[PDB]
Amino acid sequence: EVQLVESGGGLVQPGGSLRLSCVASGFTFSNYNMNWVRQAPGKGLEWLSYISSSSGTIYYADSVKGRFTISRDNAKNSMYLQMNSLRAEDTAVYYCVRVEYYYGSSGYYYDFDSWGQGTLVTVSSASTKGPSVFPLAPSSKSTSGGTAALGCLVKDYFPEPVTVSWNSGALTSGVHTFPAVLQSSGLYSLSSVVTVPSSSLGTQTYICNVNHKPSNTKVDKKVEPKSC
Amino acid sequence: DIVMTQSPLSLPVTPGEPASISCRSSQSLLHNGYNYLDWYLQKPGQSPQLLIYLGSNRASGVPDRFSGSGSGTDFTLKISRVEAEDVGVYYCMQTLQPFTFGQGTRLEIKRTVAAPSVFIFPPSDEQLKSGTASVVCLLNNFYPREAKVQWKVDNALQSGNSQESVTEQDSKDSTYSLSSTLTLSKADYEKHKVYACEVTHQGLSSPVTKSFNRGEC
């Protein structure tokens, strides 16, 4: 099968630089035009750059023109995106895309037929920081007929992402993990809630597992019910 | 670059009923009888896939439900019968000056109106010991997405101190969930009495309010 794998993503401050790499497997890379496409959080896909197989044709989007440089090494089955003068709005997942060019009966057309899993690039002045996990205890304010609402508050971490589970993966029904928001401090914050039967507040202990790989932080916090 | 404009951004469709998405171009994409515009679909957790090429031609393996039309600067992607597997973000892409995507139209499941179960969580004592206080308003399993959450402290209208977050449409219930977090310093939190979030939705008879008193519990 066709497999594109991006690497080189990570952290950088405004004005800084970082170089992305994409390795291609499962096909003759030297016979294919290729693309770089990114997607910022909560935004649509944005094409960035194009390069032909022979590097003789290169296109750039105006948003990255003069700041980003595309190139490729067919002997190494690889493609690169040199990113300079990075800005906060360049924070996105960057995708490596194969551009197939069919010549059918109805006319010639492109087909972006292979996308890698992407690599995350964050442009910010913030430093890497593990999250603080605060409980959202079930209480009188959590009102429901036979069910209760509880969760955890994953606050003030950088960068994305974090993974949240409940009871090490046992509790999966009714779990809602919200998309993180970027606070004015430059740190991220999200909440993960779950609705469980209120008659199980004394019976079952509910623990939220928060893992933040960039900071090597791993927190398991039990949400104690409020007896009011 | 050439500017691509899609409308709407979210399109609730009932399964079995038609649906159409518009795409506008800043300049004409017609050249020598060909319309240089393609339509892509990005399903949840999947890579984008080619649907329509050259304006009106279906790619290999694309069902007859999908169809493209238009010319110059106005183009339309139409689905005669929307299936449940068609949810996702639909993009139009101009290829006259490669390349430019549109904003994208998220096709969502249209269902009966639902009422949000509103909850509120006071700041944990562990967080108060760190000098900050966060109150979380929770709107669980409602429909549609539209919902107004206003934070009222001592019946005063707060502004610029809350943040909102909405989950993706559920795969089984086809519902949403909203989270509003009011962040205040411990000093400002210990200077006021009543905290509440006022929820406004069409599934409610009138703006439902959930409140709590500082200190309790």
Numbering used by the authors:
A (entry chain C): 1 to 228
B (entry chain D): 1 to 217
Task: Tell me what the authors wrote about this structure, in their words.
Pfs25 is important for ookinete survival in the protease-rich mosquito midgut, and Pfs25 assists in the invasion of the midgut epithelium and maturation of the oocyst. When present in a blood meal, anti-Pfs25 antibodies significantly inhibit the development of oocysts in an in vivo standard membrane feeding assay (SMFA). We determine the co-crystal structures of four human antibodies bound to Pfs25, and describe three novel protective epitopes on Pfs25, including the most potent mAb yet described from any organism.
The crystal structure of unliganded 2544 showed high similarity to Pfs25-bound 2544 (overall root mean square deviation (RMSD) < 0.5 Å for the Fv). Five mutations (G55S and D100GY in the heavy chain and T91A, P94T, and F95P in the light chain) appeared to be the most critical reversion mutations for Pfs25 binding.
